[PDB]
Amino acid sequence: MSVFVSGANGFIAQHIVDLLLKEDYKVIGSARSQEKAENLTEAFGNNPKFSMEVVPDISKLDAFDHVFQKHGKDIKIVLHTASPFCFDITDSERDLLIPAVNGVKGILHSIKKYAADSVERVVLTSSYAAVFDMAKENDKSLTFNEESWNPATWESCQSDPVNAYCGSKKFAEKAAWEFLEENRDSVKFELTAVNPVYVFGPQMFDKDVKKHLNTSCELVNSLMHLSPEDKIPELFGGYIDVRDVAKAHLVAFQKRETIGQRLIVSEARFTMQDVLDILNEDFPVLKGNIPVGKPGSGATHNTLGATLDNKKSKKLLGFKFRNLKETIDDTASQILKFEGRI
Numbered sequence: 329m330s331v332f333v334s335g336a337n338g339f340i341a342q343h344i345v346d347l348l349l350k351e352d353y354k355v356i357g358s359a360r361s362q363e364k365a366e367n368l369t370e371a372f373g374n375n376p377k378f379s380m381e382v383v384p385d386i387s388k389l390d391a392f393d394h395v396f397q398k399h400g401k402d403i404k405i406v407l408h409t410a411s412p413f414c415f416d417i418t419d420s421e422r423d424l425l426i427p428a429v430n431g432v433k434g435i436l437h438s439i440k441k442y443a444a445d446s447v448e449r450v451v452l453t454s455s456y457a458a459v460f461d462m463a464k465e466n467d468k469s470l471t472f473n474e475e476s477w478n479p480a481t482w483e484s485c486q487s488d489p490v491n492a493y494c495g496s497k498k499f500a501e502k503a504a505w506e507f508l509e510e511n512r513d514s515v516k517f518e519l520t521a522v523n524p525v526y527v528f529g530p531q532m533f534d535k536d537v538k539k540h541l542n543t544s545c546e547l548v549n550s551l552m553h554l555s556p557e558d559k560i561p562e563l564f565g566g567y568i569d570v571r572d573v574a575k576a577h578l579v580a581f582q583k584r585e586t587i588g589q590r591l592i593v594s595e596a597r598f599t600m601q602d603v604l605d606i607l608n609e610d611f612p613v614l615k616g617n618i619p620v621g622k623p624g625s626g627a628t629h630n631t632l633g634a635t636l637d638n639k640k641s642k643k644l645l646g647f648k649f650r651n652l653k654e655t656i657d658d659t660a661s662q663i664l665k666f667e668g669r670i
Protein backbone atom coordinates (compact mmCIF):
# COMPACT_ATOMS: atom_id res chain seq x y z
CA MET A 329 0.00 0.00 0.00
CA SER A 330 1.41 3.39 -0.97
CA VAL A 331 0.65 7.08 -0.84
CA PHE A 332 1.55 9.13 -3.91
CA VAL A 333 2.51 12.79 -3.40
CA SER A 334 2.88 15.04 -6.45
CA GLY A 335 5.38 17.93 -6.14
CA ALA A 336 6.94 16.28 -3.08
CA ASN A 337 9.82 18.76 -2.78
CA GLY A 338 7.43 21.70 -2.38
CA PHE A 339 7.11 23.72 0.82
CA ILE A 340 3.81 22.19 2.03
CA ALA A 341 4.47 18.77 0.46
CA GLN A 342 7.72 18.13 2.33
CA HIS A 343 5.79 18.49 5.62
CA ILE A 344 3.17 16.06 4.28
CA VAL A 345 5.89 13.57 3.35
CA ASP A 346 7.24 14.05 6.88
CA LEU A 347 3.92 13.23 8.57
CA LEU A 348 3.28 10.25 6.29
CA LEU A 349 6.67 8.70 7.06
CA LYS A 350 6.10 9.15 10.81
CA GLU A 351 2.72 7.40 10.55
CA ASP A 352 4.48 4.49 8.78
CA TYR A 353 3.10 4.88 5.24
CA LYS A 354 5.11 3.86 2.23
CA VAL A 355 5.45 7.09 0.23
CA ILE A 356 6.14 7.82 -3.44
CA GLY A 357 6.68 11.41 -4.55
CA SER A 358 7.28 13.20 -7.81
CA ALA A 359 9.77 15.98 -8.52
CA ARG A 360 10.73 17.82 -11.67
CA SER A 361 14.20 16.31 -11.94
CA GLN A 362 16.37 13.40 -10.85
CA GLU A 363 18.48 15.99 -8.96
CA LYS A 364 15.61 17.35 -6.83
CA ALA A 365 14.40 13.76 -6.31
CA GLU A 366 17.75 12.52 -4.97
CA ASN A 367 18.11 15.64 -2.81
CA LEU A 368 14.70 14.93 -1.28
CA THR A 369 15.25 11.23 -0.49
CA GLU A 370 18.67 12.13 0.98
CA ALA A 371 17.21 14.88 3.17
CA PHE A 372 14.75 12.31 4.60
CA GLY A 373 17.68 10.06 5.56
CA ASN A 374 17.19 7.61 2.68
CA ASN A 375 14.12 6.20 4.42
CA PRO A 376 13.50 2.79 2.79
CA LYS A 377 9.74 3.56 2.86
CA PHE A 378 10.32 6.64 0.67
CA SER A 379 10.95 6.76 -3.08
CA MET A 380 10.69 9.35 -5.86
CA GLU A 381 9.76 9.54 -9.53
CA VAL A 382 10.66 12.25 -12.03
CA VAL A 383 7.66 14.10 -13.47
CA PRO A 384 9.12 17.20 -15.17
CA ASP A 385 5.94 19.09 -16.18
CA ILE A 386 2.33 18.78 -15.05
CA SER A 387 1.09 20.81 -18.04
CA LYS A 388 1.50 17.53 -19.96
CA LEU A 389 -1.78 15.57 -19.71
CA ASP A 390 0.10 12.25 -19.69
CA ALA A 391 2.73 13.46 -17.18
CA PHE A 392 1.70 10.94 -14.48
CA ASP A 393 1.03 7.99 -16.85
CA HIS A 394 4.36 6.28 -16.09
CA VAL A 395 4.05 6.38 -12.26
CA PHE A 396 0.55 4.88 -12.30
CA GLN A 397 1.55 2.46 -15.09
CA LYS A 398 4.15 0.86 -12.84
CA HIS A 399 2.84 1.64 -9.32
CA GLY A 400 -0.92 2.01 -9.84
CA LYS A 401 -1.61 -1.38 -8.26
CA ASP A 402 0.28 -0.33 -5.11
CA ILE A 403 -1.10 3.23 -4.90
CA LYS A 404 -4.02 3.53 -2.50
CA ILE A 405 -3.90 7.27 -1.75
CA VAL A 406 -3.12 10.16 -4.08
CA LEU A 407 -2.29 13.62 -2.71
CA HIS A 408 -2.08 15.99 -5.67
CA THR A 409 -0.28 19.05 -4.36
CA ALA A 410 1.71 20.21 -7.41
CA SER A 411 0.54 23.50 -8.97
CA PRO A 412 2.43 26.58 -10.18
CA PHE A 413 2.60 29.22 -7.42
CA CYS A 414 5.35 31.25 -9.06
CA PHE A 415 5.21 34.75 -10.52
CA ASP A 416 8.20 35.21 -12.80
CA ILE A 417 5.79 34.37 -15.65
CA THR A 418 5.27 35.61 -19.22
CA ASP A 419 1.64 34.52 -19.81
CA SER A 420 -1.20 33.78 -17.35
CA GLU A 421 -3.11 31.22 -19.43
CA ARG A 422 0.06 29.31 -20.26
CA ASP A 423 2.09 29.56 -17.05
CA LEU A 424 -0.71 29.41 -14.52
CA LEU A 425 -4.05 28.24 -15.93
CA ILE A 426 -3.04 25.42 -18.32
CA PRO A 427 -0.47 23.68 -16.03
CA ALA A 428 -2.71 23.79 -12.95
CA VAL A 429 -5.79 22.62 -14.87
CA ASN A 430 -3.96 19.99 -16.96
CA GLY A 431 -2.15 18.86 -13.79
CA VAL A 432 -5.48 17.86 -12.29
CA LYS A 433 -6.99 16.49 -15.53
CA GLY A 434 -3.80 14.53 -16.21
CA ILE A 435 -3.32 12.78 -12.87
CA LEU A 436 -6.99 11.83 -12.59
CA HIS A 437 -6.91 10.36 -16.12
CA SER A 438 -3.73 8.45 -15.19
CA ILE A 439 -5.64 7.04 -12.20
CA LYS A 440 -8.63 6.13 -14.40
CA LYS A 441 -6.40 4.41 -16.94
CA TYR A 442 -3.99 2.47 -14.70
CA ALA A 443 -5.29 2.48 -11.09
CA ALA A 444 -9.10 2.76 -11.27
CA ASP A 445 -9.54 -0.15 -8.87
CA SER A 446 -6.74 0.49 -6.38
CA VAL A 447 -6.85 4.24 -5.63
CA GLU A 448 -9.25 4.73 -2.75
CA ARG A 449 -8.70 8.39 -1.87
CA VAL A 450 -7.66 11.49 -3.78
CA VAL A 451 -6.84 14.73 -2.01
CA LEU A 452 -6.36 17.94 -3.97
CA THR A 453 -4.39 20.85 -2.57
CA SER A 454 -6.65 23.62 -3.76
CA SER A 455 -6.77 27.09 -2.15
CA TYR A 456 -8.83 29.67 -0.27
CA ALA A 457 -8.18 31.52 -3.54
CA ALA A 458 -10.74 29.10 -5.06
CA VAL A 459 -13.25 30.18 -2.39
CA PHE A 460 -13.03 33.94 -1.88
CA ASP A 461 -13.90 37.07 -3.81
CA MET A 462 -10.85 39.34 -3.93
CA ALA A 463 -12.87 42.49 -4.66
CA LYS A 464 -14.99 41.72 -1.58
CA GLU A 465 -12.58 40.50 1.17
CA ASN A 466 -12.59 44.07 2.54
CA ASP A 467 -16.36 44.11 3.20
CA LYS A 468 -17.20 43.39 6.86
CA SER A 469 -20.85 42.53 6.09
CA LEU A 470 -20.22 39.54 3.79
CA THR A 471 -19.43 35.93 4.74
CA PHE A 472 -17.33 33.27 2.98
CA ASN A 473 -17.43 29.55 3.76
CA GLU A 474 -16.79 26.06 2.29
CA GLU A 475 -19.77 26.42 -0.06
CA SER A 476 -18.42 29.73 -1.45
CA TRP A 477 -16.67 29.82 -4.84
CA ASN A 478 -14.40 32.35 -6.57
CA PRO A 479 -16.69 34.24 -9.02
CA ALA A 480 -13.94 34.78 -11.64
CA THR A 481 -14.18 33.13 -15.06
CA TRP A 482 -11.61 31.81 -17.47
CA GLU A 483 -10.69 35.06 -19.26
CA SER A 484 -11.85 37.41 -16.47
CA CYS A 485 -9.18 36.11 -14.07
CA GLN A 486 -6.51 36.76 -16.72
CA SER A 487 -6.57 40.52 -15.94
CA ASP A 488 -3.40 40.16 -13.81
CA PRO A 489 -1.10 37.29 -12.58
CA VAL A 490 -2.46 37.28 -9.00
CA ASN A 491 -6.05 37.00 -10.31
CA ALA A 492 -4.91 34.36 -12.81
CA TYR A 493 -3.28 32.33 -10.05
CA CYS A 494 -6.52 32.50 -8.05
CA GLY A 495 -8.51 31.44 -11.13
CA SER A 496 -6.06 28.60 -11.78
CA LYS A 497 -6.78 27.21 -8.31
CA LYS A 498 -10.55 27.59 -8.93
CA PHE A 499 -10.42 25.83 -12.31
CA ALA A 500 -8.06 23.06 -11.27
CA GLU A 501 -10.50 22.33 -8.41
CA LYS A 502 -13.63 22.56 -10.57
CA ALA A 503 -11.97 20.13 -13.01
CA ALA A 504 -11.37 17.63 -10.19
CA TRP A 505 -15.03 17.77 -9.07
CA GLU A 506 -16.19 17.63 -12.71
CA PHE A 507 -13.98 14.61 -13.46
CA LEU A 508 -15.49 12.75 -10.50
CA GLU A 509 -18.99 13.71 -11.72
CA GLU A 510 -18.28 12.46 -15.25
CA ASN A 511 -16.55 9.22 -14.18
CA ARG A 512 -18.30 8.31 -10.94
CA ASP A 513 -19.22 4.82 -12.13
CA SER A 514 -15.79 4.21 -13.70
CA VAL A 515 -13.55 4.98 -10.68
CA LYS A 516 -13.41 3.74 -7.08
CA PHE A 517 -11.80 6.81 -5.46
CA GLU A 518 -13.34 9.47 -3.25
CA LEU A 519 -12.28 13.09 -3.55
CA THR A 520 -11.44 15.76 -0.98
CA ALA A 521 -10.24 19.31 -1.51
CA VAL A 522 -7.96 21.00 1.03
CA ASN A 523 -8.09 24.80 0.75
CA PRO A 524 -5.38 26.65 2.67
CA VAL A 525 -5.14 30.37 3.30
CA TYR A 526 -1.69 31.99 3.43
CA VAL A 527 0.67 29.30 4.65
CA PHE A 528 3.51 30.22 6.99
CA GLY A 529 5.92 28.26 9.12
CA PRO A 530 9.38 26.76 8.80
CA GLN A 531 10.87 24.91 5.83
CA MET A 532 11.14 21.19 6.49
CA PHE A 533 14.96 21.40 6.20
CA ASP A 534 17.33 24.25 7.08
CA LYS A 535 19.23 23.79 3.80
CA ASP A 536 16.16 25.02 2.01
CA VAL A 537 16.30 28.39 3.76
CA LYS A 538 17.70 30.61 1.04
CA LYS A 539 17.80 34.27 0.00
CA HIS A 540 14.28 34.06 -1.42
CA LEU A 541 11.70 31.50 -0.32
CA ASN A 542 8.43 30.00 -1.55
CA THR A 543 6.09 32.90 -2.28
CA SER A 544 3.84 32.59 0.84
CA CYS A 545 6.91 32.49 3.12
CA GLU A 546 8.73 35.13 1.07
CA LEU A 547 6.14 37.57 2.49
CA VAL A 548 7.74 37.14 5.92
CA ASN A 549 11.32 36.96 4.60
CA SER A 550 10.57 40.20 2.71
CA LEU A 551 9.10 41.98 5.76
CA MET A 552 12.19 41.07 7.81
CA HIS A 553 14.34 42.94 5.26
CA LEU A 554 12.44 46.22 5.19
CA SER A 555 14.04 49.23 6.91
CA PRO A 556 12.03 51.26 9.49
CA GLU A 557 11.13 54.02 6.99
CA ASP A 558 10.03 51.55 4.26
CA LYS A 559 6.34 51.32 3.38
CA ILE A 560 4.33 48.42 4.81
CA PRO A 561 2.68 46.13 2.20
CA GLU A 562 -1.13 46.03 2.32
CA LEU A 563 -2.45 42.52 2.88
CA PHE A 564 -5.50 41.04 4.55
CA GLY A 565 -6.20 37.31 4.70
CA GLY A 566 -6.41 34.11 6.70
CA TYR A 567 -3.26 32.45 8.01
CA ILE A 568 -2.32 28.87 8.78
CA ASP A 569 0.85 27.06 9.80
CA VAL A 570 2.36 24.59 7.32
CA ARG A 571 2.48 21.70 9.77
CA ASP A 572 -1.25 22.19 10.31
CA VAL A 573 -1.82 22.25 6.54
CA ALA A 574 0.15 19.01 6.13
CA LYS A 575 -1.85 17.35 8.92
CA ALA A 576 -5.08 18.54 7.27
CA HIS A 577 -4.04 16.51 4.20
CA LEU A 578 -3.64 13.31 6.24
CA VAL A 579 -6.97 13.81 8.05
CA ALA A 580 -8.56 14.50 4.64
CA PHE A 581 -7.79 11.00 3.39
CA GLN A 582 -8.04 9.08 6.67
CA LYS A 583 -11.55 10.23 7.62
CA ARG A 584 -14.93 9.02 6.37
CA GLU A 585 -16.51 12.44 6.99
CA THR A 586 -14.06 14.31 4.73
CA ILE A 587 -15.35 12.44 1.66
CA GLY A 588 -16.54 15.01 -0.92
CA GLN A 589 -15.69 18.03 1.24
CA ARG A 590 -13.77 21.24 0.78
CA LEU A 591 -11.66 21.94 3.84
CA ILE A 592 -10.54 25.51 4.46
CA VAL A 593 -7.43 25.29 6.62
CA SER A 594 -7.40 28.70 8.29
CA GLU A 595 -6.83 29.70 11.89
CA ALA A 596 -7.81 33.39 11.87
CA ARG A 597 -7.12 36.68 10.09
CA PHE A 598 -3.95 38.77 9.88
CA THR A 599 -2.43 41.80 8.19
CA MET A 600 1.27 42.69 7.96
CA GLN A 601 0.85 44.90 11.02
CA ASP A 602 0.11 41.76 13.09
CA VAL A 603 3.27 40.20 11.68
CA LEU A 604 5.31 43.32 12.53
CA ASP A 605 3.97 43.39 16.10
CA ILE A 606 5.19 39.81 16.59
CA LEU A 607 8.58 40.26 14.93
CA ASN A 608 9.23 43.43 16.91
CA GLU A 609 8.33 41.80 20.24
CA ASP A 610 9.89 38.34 19.87
CA PHE A 611 13.13 39.27 18.09
CA PRO A 612 15.19 42.07 19.74
CA VAL A 613 17.61 41.90 16.79
CA LEU A 614 14.75 43.03 14.53
CA LYS A 615 13.33 45.81 16.75
CA GLY A 616 14.73 49.13 15.51
CA ASN A 617 15.68 47.57 12.17
CA ILE A 618 12.20 46.99 10.70
CA PRO A 619 8.98 49.06 10.48
CA VAL A 620 6.71 49.48 13.51
CA GLY A 621 3.60 50.87 11.75
CA LYS A 622 0.59 51.29 14.04
CA PRO A 623 0.99 48.50 16.63
CA GLY A 624 -2.25 46.78 17.65
CA SER A 625 -4.22 47.89 14.58
CA GLY A 626 -3.92 44.62 12.65
CA ALA A 627 -6.51 41.83 12.46
CA THR A 628 -5.44 40.08 15.69
CA HIS A 629 -7.14 43.00 17.48
CA ASN A 630 -9.66 44.28 14.92
CA THR A 631 -12.31 42.92 12.57
CA LEU A 632 -11.02 44.32 9.27
CA GLY A 633 -12.89 42.42 6.53
CA ALA A 634 -15.34 39.72 5.45
CA THR A 635 -15.93 36.78 7.78
CA LEU A 636 -14.12 33.58 6.85
CA ASP A 637 -16.35 30.91 8.34
CA ASN A 638 -14.48 27.61 8.30
CA LYS A 639 -16.10 26.28 11.48
CA LYS A 640 -17.31 23.19 9.59
CA SER A 641 -13.74 22.46 8.41
CA LYS A 642 -12.29 23.00 11.91
CA LYS A 643 -14.81 20.48 13.25
CA LEU A 644 -14.08 17.96 10.44
CA LEU A 645 -10.31 18.23 10.94
CA GLY A 646 -10.58 17.73 14.72
CA PHE A 647 -7.37 19.36 15.95
CA LYS A 648 -6.38 22.87 17.02
CA PHE A 649 -4.21 25.18 14.91
CA ARG A 650 -1.07 27.11 15.83
CA ASN A 651 -1.64 30.83 16.42
CA LEU A 652 0.06 33.62 14.43
CA LYS A 653 2.75 34.18 17.05
CA GLU A 654 3.85 30.55 16.88
CA THR A 655 3.88 30.28 13.09
CA ILE A 656 5.62 33.66 12.58
CA ASP A 657 8.18 32.93 15.30
CA ASP A 658 9.10 29.61 13.70
CA THR A 659 9.43 31.17 10.22
CA ALA A 660 11.42 34.21 11.41
CA SER A 661 13.75 32.35 13.77
CA GLN A 662 14.66 29.74 11.14
CA ILE A 663 15.49 32.58 8.72
CA LEU A 664 17.57 34.42 11.34
CA LYS A 665 19.50 31.18 11.82
CA PHE A 666 20.39 31.26 8.09
CA GLU A 667 21.31 34.96 8.24
CA GLY A 668 23.36 34.31 11.40
CA ARG A 669 21.53 36.79 13.65
CA ILE A 670 19.81 34.48 16.20
Ligand SMILES: NC(=O)C1=CN([C@@H]2O[C@H](COP(=O)(O)OP(=O)(O)OC[C@H]3O[C@@H](n4cnc5c(N)ncnc54)[C@H](OP(=O)(O)O)[C@@H]3O)[C@@H](O)[C@H]2O)C=CC1
Pocket residue numbers: 335336337338339340341360364383384385386387409410411412413427453454455456497523524525526527528542543544545
Ligand atom coordinates in the same frame (compact mmCIF):
# COMPACT_ATOMS: atom_id res chain seq x y z
N1 LIG B 1 1.78 28.51 0.31
C1 LIG B 1 0.51 28.92 0.37
O1 LIG B 1 0.14 30.07 1.10
C2 LIG B 1 -0.57 28.15 -0.34
C3 LIG B 1 -0.27 27.13 -1.25
N2 LIG B 1 -1.28 26.44 -1.89
C4 LIG B 1 -1.01 25.31 -2.79
O2 LIG B 1 -0.10 24.37 -2.25
C5 LIG B 1 0.57 23.72 -3.31
C6 LIG B 1 2.07 23.79 -3.09
O3 LIG B 1 2.45 25.15 -2.93
P1 LIG B 1 3.60 25.60 -1.91
O4 LIG B 1 4.18 24.40 -1.26
O5 LIG B 1 3.01 26.68 -1.10
O6 LIG B 1 4.68 26.34 -2.85
P2 LIG B 1 5.89 25.65 -3.64
O7 LIG B 1 6.35 26.55 -4.73
O8 LIG B 1 7.01 25.29 -2.74
O9 LIG B 1 5.24 24.31 -4.25
C7 LIG B 1 4.96 24.16 -5.63
C8 LIG B 1 5.25 22.72 -6.05
O10 LIG B 1 4.63 22.45 -7.30
C9 LIG B 1 5.61 22.07 -8.25
N3 LIG B 1 5.27 22.58 -9.58
C10 LIG B 1 4.86 23.84 -9.91
N4 LIG B 1 4.66 23.87 -11.25
C11 LIG B 1 4.94 22.65 -11.76
C12 LIG B 1 4.90 22.13 -13.05
N5 LIG B 1 4.40 22.84 -14.05
N6 LIG B 1 5.25 20.81 -13.26
C13 LIG B 1 5.63 20.00 -12.21
N7 LIG B 1 5.66 20.53 -10.93
C14 LIG B 1 5.32 21.82 -10.72
C15 LIG B 1 6.89 22.69 -7.75
O11 LIG B 1 8.06 22.12 -8.30
P3 LIG B 1 9.46 22.92 -8.14
O12 LIG B 1 9.75 23.21 -6.69
O13 LIG B 1 10.59 22.08 -8.67
O14 LIG B 1 9.38 24.21 -8.91
C16 LIG B 1 6.74 22.49 -6.26
O15 LIG B 1 7.06 21.16 -5.92
C17 LIG B 1 0.17 24.43 -4.60
O16 LIG B 1 -0.78 23.62 -5.27
C18 LIG B 1 -0.44 25.73 -4.12
O17 LIG B 1 -1.47 26.21 -4.95
C19 LIG B 1 -2.60 26.70 -1.65
C20 LIG B 1 -3.00 27.68 -0.76
C21 LIG B 1 -2.00 28.52 -0.02
